[PDB]
Amino acid sequence: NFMLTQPHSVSESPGKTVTISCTGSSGSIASNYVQWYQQRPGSAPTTVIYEDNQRPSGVPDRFSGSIDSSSNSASLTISGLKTEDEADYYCQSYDSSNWVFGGGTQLTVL
Amino acid sequence: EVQLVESGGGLVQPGGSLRLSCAASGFTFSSYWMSWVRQAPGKGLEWVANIKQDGSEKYYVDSVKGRFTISRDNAKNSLYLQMNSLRAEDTAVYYCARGQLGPWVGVDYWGQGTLVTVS
Amino acid sequence: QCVNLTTRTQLPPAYTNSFTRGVYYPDKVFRSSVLHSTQDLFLPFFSNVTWFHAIHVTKRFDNPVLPFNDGVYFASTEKSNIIRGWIFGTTLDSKTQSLLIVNNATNVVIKVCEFQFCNDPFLGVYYHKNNKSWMESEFRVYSSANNCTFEYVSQPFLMDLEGKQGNFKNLREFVFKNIDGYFKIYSKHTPINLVRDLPQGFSALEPLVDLPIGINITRFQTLLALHRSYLTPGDSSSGWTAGAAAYYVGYLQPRTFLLKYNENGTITDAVDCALDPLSETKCTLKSFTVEKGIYQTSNFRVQPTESIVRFPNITNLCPFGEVFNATRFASVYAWNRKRISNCVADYSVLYNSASFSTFKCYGVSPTKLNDLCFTNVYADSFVIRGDEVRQIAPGQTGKIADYNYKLPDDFTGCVIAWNSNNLDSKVGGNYNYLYRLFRKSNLKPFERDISTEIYQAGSTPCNGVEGFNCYFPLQSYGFQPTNGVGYQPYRVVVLSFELLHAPATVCGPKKSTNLVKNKCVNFNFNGLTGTGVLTESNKKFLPFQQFGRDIADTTDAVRDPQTLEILDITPCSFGGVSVITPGTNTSNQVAVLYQDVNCNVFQTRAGCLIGAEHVNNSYECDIPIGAGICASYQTSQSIIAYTMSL
Ligand SMILES: *[C@@H]1O[C@H](CO)[C@@H](O[C@@H]2O[C@H](CO)[C@@H](O)[C@H](O)[C@H]2NC(C)=O)[C@H](O)[C@H]1NC(C)=O
Ligand SMILES: *[C@@H]1O[C@H](CO)[C@@H](O)[C@H](O)[C@H]1NC(C)=O
Ligand SMILES: *[C@@H]1O[C@H](CO)[C@@H](O)[C@H](O)[C@H]1NC(C)=O
Ligand SMILES: *[C@@H]1O[C@H](CO)[C@@H](O)[C@H](O)[C@H]1NC(C)=O
Ligand SMILES: *[C@@H]1O[C@H](CO)[C@@H](O)[C@H](O)[C@H]1NC(C)=O
Ligand SMILES: *[C@@H]1O[C@H](CO)[C@@H](O)[C@H](O)[C@H]1NC(C)=O
Ligand SMILES: *[C@@H]1O[C@H](CO)[C@@H](O)[C@H](O)[C@H]1NC(C)=O
Ligand SMILES: *[C@@H]1O[C@H](CO)[C@@H](O)[C@H](O)[C@H]1NC(C)=O
Ligand SMILES: *[C@@H]1O[C@H](CO)[C@@H](O)[C@H](O)[C@H]1NC(C)=O
Structure with missing residues (x-):
């Protein structure tokens, strides 16, 4: 019964660094890889951070990730906070032959 | 550059049978994992099903367990998704999700999708 | 302030041809009777140029924001002085420094700051009722600017603001360049009597000014002036007039030009090197x-087209089967150690399956494993319950992590874990698996212990018998078929990869593209990156050889490893472009001759000759070519090739 807990409205700030936390409760998220997905509102989703330490070609370096095993939470950090950030983020892990997705964190006011 | 085309919806039926297809090109279909992912309109993401490259192993979520089926072939580079005993919760848009090495790398691939509503 | 225009019927832009235009002085030096070649950005001769219209008679007003490439050419055949100036910039939103040249009726100023332009800056001209003269009042080119670092006022050029519909009488050219942050302007006023299809005359453009600016320029716009007489209502919505005007815009590209200088040090003619073979000669x-x-x-x-790789047939595999499909598994305190080497690594079935629960690869990324070649591969195997699985990762501490198995903090390997409850436990439970609870101190990574001595925790020894303050560090596990998920047994296999000075013995799988032949392609058959054709040979090879050389000691025969075919290696083609010239004051056309390249077009013994027609009859020859064939200019009249007569 693994679930991932993350907020829904954060990072409503102009031009600085803000972190978003995704955490689980049933087990440790540091055992397997977690991924962050970025979706255009009303069109195809994409992916910003994967492998916990990788980002798809063409993705700007502003985005970064980290893992805190003490609080059992995963942190996603965006540095530039430019005008191309109007999306909702998701947090995705794997327990045993199944996939669970995050609730969603809407970010519109940049 | 990988092209994904999905056209399987566009009609409403209560508790009937539906046929969805995802067409893929630009890569080798018989060497990577495959998956299907759906999203309710206005809600968050959730996972539906996944299949191996050869179609030997197919897994689903416990909500749709008992029903649902997925099959594949590598000759025509296409997917087969068949559904039965639909409910009102099934109003969602469906994306065929492409894997790289397995369930650990991530989804990283989303189609445009097809709007599917039931009424 | 600015106003917006309304949608009307315009004319699409057309394209015209330049005729020996766009030549300026490339340096500030003096050359007399010198044929000097320099590398600088000019306008190529007989090149396609962009043409815009500005005549009212309809209502053609097209001033788009054209991009600024490396050097531009601006030629205007202005007659009634309708053109005013030019502006430059990158984003045009008061964010970057942006340039403003307006030649005004009183003085010429050059201000470059973050002005706020509208969608179409323009100058408005009004006709006074009492005064029979044209004056400019609508100064609508920008709103305001914040700050800048440069400004320049030029000479007070006198302008006429009266516009007419007659033929053009003057031609003005402008060249704008930007290397290393320095702005160049080249201009020259040349009177002509023409309206269209600019003449083939030559006129070098002298430098005008050299303002140091040091900003980025990528877009530019043109400013035009319209008239408001008594005929038009005076509103800039649907009724206006602008007289007759026209301007040309061109783009410069780097080319090599040979410039002719006279005794006065003025440029007379220019000849290219990449336009015509005669010009190159x-x-x-x-x-x-x-x-x-x-x-x-x-x-x-000739350049290679494709790049084909054909590795040998990969049949070697690593013993990854029985190390995972093991019926018996050792205890945690006596974990097995197996070395895997001298085999082709195959991790495809390792990640393509999903029966495992943990696939965390520390140090190295598992997305690229077939490309990495290692020296030694080690694989441990032990069983641990579902609670003590996160303790396997380095950094964490616990009973298993510090008393039975410890991993180094610089691990560059992978951990594989999966659940097997029915196989590892019967209905009665398993009691044959042991583990350590106590140890004198901590355990150094990659160190195992086999001693089962009684551990003492207090100060008083117990004389080596069971009693108080000393117990058995070794203890068994209790397993149940109906226990919790975290108490179920899990099988953990840890992979370790290390690099030493020995040659690499493990490697990933090898792909193989399709083989094409009789084409200039590149191939890498495990010993060389050779580019050339692959013809079918008629010589057999002994069944132990993969390479092959010649008398000149060049690898020109390599066997295909997957089909056992012998293919030769040959360079594609090379040579030079020879030209035959009839001479001066006799002709103007040339013919291209190749020394040994094999292909109007005549296939001669001395290579390939094009542009010369072969004839069967023979005369005395004057221009030698080779192999008993010459060329001559004979009857119109064209360049002919024939066998020479002795
Ligand atoms: C032992 O290892 C082999 C290698 O993967 C496994 O063999 C595969 O098993 C799957 C099970 O569905 C088959 O689909 C494949 O075709 C098999 N491949 C080969 C080459 O035989 C085997 O399952 C493993 N043994 C156990 C008990 O899991
Ligand atoms: C210029 O370009 C147009 C279309 O792009 C073409 O029709 C025309 O022939 C070109 N001019 C020359 C001299 O090649
Ligand atoms: C002509 O235009 C320039 C451009 O800014 C301006 O500085 C100058 O004052 C104008 N001349 C008159 C007489 O207004
Ligand atoms: C103001 O001028 C300085 C030069 O003194 C320049 O470096 C700076 O970029 C200017 N301000 C803006 C907003 O560009
Ligand atoms: C201007 O743009 C060029 C190219 O985009 C860049 O090299 C230069 O650093 C930029 N300068 C400023 C001040 O933004
Ligand atoms: C240029 O040189 C020629 C050669 O003598 C001479 O006739 C002519 O007057 C010179 N022109 C000028 C402007 O000096
Ligand atoms: C290489 O292997 C393939 C199958 O993997 C086989 O069909 C082919 O004959 C082999 N080539 C040889 C043995 O030269
Ligand atoms: C030149 O090439 C053509 C076609 O590629 C061929 O028929 C001809 O024999 C070649 N000439 C020589 C001398 O090999
Ligand atoms: C030249 O004349 C001979 C006479 O037999 C003929 O065979 C040959 O084709 C002729 N060549 C040309 C180029 O007309």
Whole structure:
């Protein structure tokens, strides 16, 4: 019964660094890889951070990730906070032959 | 550059049978994992099903367990998704999700999708 | 302030041809009777140029924001002085420094700041009722600016603001350049009597000014002036007039030009080197007169198209089966150690399956594993319950992590874990698996212990018997079929990869593209990156050889490893471009000759000759070519090739 807990409205700030936390409760998220997905509102989703330490070609370096095993939470950090950030983020892990997705964190006011 | 085309919806039926297809090109279909992912309109993401490259192993979520089926072939580079005993919760848009090495790398691939509503 | 225009019917832009235009002085030096070649950005001769219209008679007003490439050419055949100035910039939103040249009726100023432009800056001209003269009042080019670092006021050029519909009488050219942050303007006023299809005359453009600016420029716009007489209502919505005007815009590209100088040090003629073979022959000889004979200008070389890789047949595999499909598994305190080497690594079935629960690869990324080749591969195996699985990762501490198995903090390997409850436990439970609870101190990574001595925790020894303050560090596990998920047994296999000075013995799988032949392609058959064709040979090879050389000691025969075919290696083609010239004051066309390249077009013994027609009859020859065949200019009249007569 693994679930991932993350907020829904954060990072409503102009031009600085803000972190978003995704955490689980049933087990440790540091055992397997977690991924962050970025979706255009009303069109195809994409992916910003994967492998916990990788980002798809063409993705700007502003985005970064980290893992805190003490609080059992995963942190996603965006540095530039430019005008191309109007999306909702998701947090995705794997327990045993199944996939669970995050609730969603809407970010519109940049 | 990988092209994904999905056209399987566009009609409403209560508790009937539906046929969805995802067409893929630009890569080798018989060497990577495959998956299907759906999203309710206005809600968050959730996972539906996944299949191996050869179609030997197919897994689903416990909500749709008992029903649902997925099959594949590598000759025509296409997917087969068949559904039965639909409910009102099934109003969602469906994306065929492409894997790289397995369930650990991530989804990283989303189609445009097809709007599917039931009424 | 600015206003917006309304949608109307316009005219699409057309394209015209330049005729020996766009030549300026490339330096500030003096050359007299010198044929000097320089590398600088000019306008190529007979090149496609962009043409815009500005005549009212309809309502053609097209001033788009054209991009600024490396150097531009701006030629205007202005007659009634309708053109005013030019502006430059990158984003045009008061974010970057942006340039403003307006030649005004009183003085010429050059201000470059973050002005706020509208969608179409323009100058408005009004006709006064009492005064029979045209004056400019609507100063609508920007709103305001914040700050800048440069400004320049030029000479007070006198302008006429009256607009007419007559034929053009003057031609003005402008060249704008930007290297290393320095702005160049080249201009020259040349009177002409023409309206369209600019003449083939030559006129070098002298430098005008050299403002140091040091900003980025990528977009530019044109400013135009319209008239408001008594006929039009005076509103800039649907009724206006602008007289007759026209302007041309061109883009400069880097080319090599040979410039002719006279005794006065003025440019007279220019000849290119990459436009015509005759021009190349003229510019290579550093002379404007070419006599009859053979000439060599440059070389010709074919480039490879594809890149094919055909590795040998991969049948070698690593023993990854029985190390995972093991019926018996050792205890945690006596974990097995197996070395895997001298085999082709195959991790495809390792990640393509999903029966495992943990696939965390520390140090190295598992997304690229077939490309990495290692020296030694080690694989441990032990069983641990589902609670003590996160303790396997380095950094964490616990009973298993510090008393039975410890991993180094610089691990560059992978951990594989999966659940097997029915196989590892019967209905009665398993009690044959042991583990350590106590140890004198901590355990150094990659160190195992086999001693089962009684551990003492207090100060008083117990004389080696069971009693108080000392117990058995070794203890068994209790397993149940109906226990919790975290108490179920899990099988953990840890992979370790290390690099030493020995040659690499493990490697990933090898792909193989399709084989094409009889084409200039590149291949890498495990010993060389050779580019060339692959013809079918008729010589067999002994069944132990993969390479092959010749008398000149060049690898020219390599066997295909997957089909056992012998293919030869040959360079694609190379040579030079020879040209035959009839001479000066006799003709103007040349013919291209290749020394050994095999293909109007005549296939001669001495290579390939094009542009010369072969004839069967024979005369005395003057221009030698080779192999008993010459060339001559004979009857109109064209360049003919024939066998020489003795
Ligand atoms: C032992 O290892 C082999 C290698 O993966 C496994 O063999 C595969 O098993 C799957 C099970 O569905 C088959 O689909 C494949 O075709 C098999 N491949 C080969 C080459 O035989 C085997 O399952 C493993 N044994 C156990 C008990 O899991
Ligand atoms: C210029 O370009 C147009 C279309 O792009 C073409 O029709 C025309 O022939 C070109 N001019 C020359 C001299 O090649
Ligand atoms: C002509 O235009 C320039 C451009 O800014 C301006 O500085 C100058 O004052 C104008 N002349 C008159 C007489 O207003
Ligand atoms: C103001 O001028 C300085 C030069 O003194 C320049 O470096 C700076 O970029 C200017 N301000 C803006 C907003 O560009
Ligand atoms: C202007 O743009 C060029 C190219 O985009 C860049 O090299 C230069 O650093 C930029 N300068 C400023 C001040 O933004
Ligand atoms: C240029 O040189 C020629 C050669 O003598 C001479 O006739 C002519 O007057 C010179 N022109 C100028 C402007 O000096
Ligand atoms: C290489 O292997 C393939 C199958 O993997 C086989 O069909 C082919 O004959 C082999 N080539 C040889 C043995 O030269
Ligand atoms: C030149 O090439 C053509 C076609 O590629 C061929 O028929 C001809 O024999 C070649 N000439 C020589 C001398 O090999
Ligand atoms: C030249 O004349 C001979 C006479 O037999 C003929 O065979 C040959 O084809 C002729 N060549 C040309 C180029 O007309």
